[PDB]
Design a protein around this ligand. Structure first.
Ligand code: NAG
Lengths: 50, 43
């Protein structure tokens, strides 16, 4: 028998479910969800250096 | 030791500790004398 106990505290949550990579589509108007930032735009190539 | 000009300070490591901090202290390195058990030094 394995008993799983889940608790929530004031500290930020750090145990969390799997995140889906899905796939990337470019040069089309697509809803994007990048690291919690949502919106709608065309993802073209960028010459900016981060 | 505090020079002029600007040197941007880059990030190093953000840590989700979530604890209470009010005091801090510096840790130094000391070598055993093997001969006054630790070699004299300054920081
Ligand atoms: C953090 O510790 C200090 C000193 O013990 C105390 O005054 C302060 O209330 C503490 N913070 C919290 C959120 O309890």
């Amino acid at each position: 028998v394995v008993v799983l106990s889940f608790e929530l505290l004031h500290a930020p949550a750090t145990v969390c479910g799997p995140k889906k990579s899905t796939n990337l589509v470019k040069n089309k108007c697509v809803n994007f969800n990048f690291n919690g930032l949502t919106g709608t735009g065309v993802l073209t190539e960028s010459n900016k250096k981060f | 030791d505090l020079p002029q000009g600007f040197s941007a300070l880059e990030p190093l490591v953000d840590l989700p500790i979530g604890i209470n901090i009010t005091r801090f202290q510096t840790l130094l390195a000391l070598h055993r004398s093997y001969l006054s058990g630790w070699t004299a030094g300054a920081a």
